[PDB]
Task: structure prediction
Amino acid sequence: MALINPQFPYAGPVPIPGPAPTETMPLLNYRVEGRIAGIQQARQFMPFLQGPHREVAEQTYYAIGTGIQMGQTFNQPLINTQEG
Amino acid sequence: NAGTDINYLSQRTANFSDTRKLDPKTWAAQTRRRIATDFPKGVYYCDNR
Result:
């Protein structure tokens, strides 16, 4: 967006020496076929386990029984003959 | 020698229109922006990463 100087104008570009025209043109680089080499193993001996863990520990229980329940020799009360 | 046997180092396009033509101290000044020092005597590094 330059302003044209009317007192000192200039013309378009003139030819100048050039950079040997084939040396600015590249070759198209020619890929050969390739292979991810080797026979891959199916599994890996991992350093960490792959499953979930638990944040807190919960107390577990198992039921037990008591035993054969016996009789008893109670201390027996007195007879309510109007004193009680 | 520390640059005193080189006039300049450069990286030209085709055989014409250089892109970084520098004396051996301006060349080493661009290396000091990279590795915060400069290489031993005779070694010149050019970064194009």
About this structure: The radius of gyration of chain A is 52 Å. The CA atoms of residues 23 and 29 of chain A lie 15 Å apart. Chain A is about 0% helix and 0% strand. Chain A touches chain B through five residues (CB under 8 Å).
